[PDB]
Amino acid sequence: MKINDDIKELILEYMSRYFKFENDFYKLPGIKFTDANWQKFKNGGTDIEKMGAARVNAMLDCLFDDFELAMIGKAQTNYYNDNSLKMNMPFYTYYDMFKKQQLLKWLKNNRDDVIGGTGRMYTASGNYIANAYLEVALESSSLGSGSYMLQMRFKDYSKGQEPIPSGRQNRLEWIENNLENIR
Amino acid sequence: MKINDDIKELILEYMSRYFKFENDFYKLPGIKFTDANWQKFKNGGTDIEKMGAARVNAMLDCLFDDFELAMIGKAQTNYYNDNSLKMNMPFYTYYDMFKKQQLLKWLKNNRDDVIGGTGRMYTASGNYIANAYLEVALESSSLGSGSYMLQMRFKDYSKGQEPIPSGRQNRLEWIENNLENIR
């Protein structure tokens, strides 16, 4: 993993997907931006590399599952080693493609193990954004209490917005049918 | 994951396993400490939570594979939610136990997919520590160019120090026979 402007961009991009109002994210505990300092952060005023470690990792911990944080790092290695990747696309876009390919790998080699659900996002105001993202996990990677070693998050970007159905097979079929609609 | 004193302790613990001389680690490019400031940090004089994000994550990136960084986060969730764990042991020790259990899981359910090798460690002076750690990966998690999505590191602590043999089935047998000697 490497903390740079590519991570700042990834944070701002993922913040905009999961939160309707920015204040629900930047005023969260451990993040706590003042309205003025947040605007400074977004506009390129404060360097992420010199920012407090706990603050930067609280932003990442909120927007990403710990397995996704692993994928971010692995994608970074691939991204900085290939000039064709940097030439054609920004980092956050390559990461999404890297993540999608991991899902396709799970769907090909671990299909009977693929489980899905809906994730909730905690806001600064104390409330929850119900159905903030789709969660995909490998059931056997179970850690107890709804925790999984191998877990990913996707946002449904379809125009139609097919409602995610209940049931193991119904959800597996929904994922396989919405592969081009999720990011 | 969460940046706190448990992560500082984990960094100092893993630094001592992979490096013979501390200067080979703290004077590394992304880390860049001074002989005096490194001592200040070691004996609680410097707060890791307020330290530069790129600096803290360069220490973590050096000592851990990106998949291990995911395990650190997952272990943190388990650790901070179980009073029994917090009562009996520090976090770095629980992490090692968490990591060992992931290996046992791979050895039980993915044995034909377990591959092993030796890892090199880069020092501040420009040299390499040859057999710094044992690397264990799941071959099917191959990202290409010697990169694996699921990869872990162990240090052999046997009094005997059985030499890690060449060969897929021999290395597998070595791991299964040194399960109590590796950390």
Numbering used by the authors:
A (entry chain A), B (entry chain B): 1 to 183
Reported in the publication:
Expression of the putative acr on a plasmid in a CR1-immunized S. thermophilus strain completely abolished immunity against the CRISPR-sensitive virulent phage D5842 (green), and even eliminated the residual resistance observed against phage D1811 (red). All AcrIIA6 and AcrIIA5 orthologs completely restored the plaquing efficiency of phages targeted by the CR1 system of S. thermophilus, indicating they are blocking the activity of St1Cas9.
Each monomer consists of eight α-helices and four β-strands forming a β-sheet, with the sequence topology α1α2α3α4α5α6α7β1β2β3β4α8. The superimposition of the AcrIIA6 HTH dimer onto the C.Esp1396I-dsDNA complex brings the AcrIIA6 helix 3 into contact with the two major grooves of the dsDNA. Helix 3 exhibits strong electropositivity, a feature observed in dsDNA binding helices, including the one from C.Esp1396I. We mapped the sequence conservation among the 48 unique AcrIIA6 alleles to the structure obtained. The dimerization interface is largely conserved as are the DNA-interacting arms of the HTH motif.
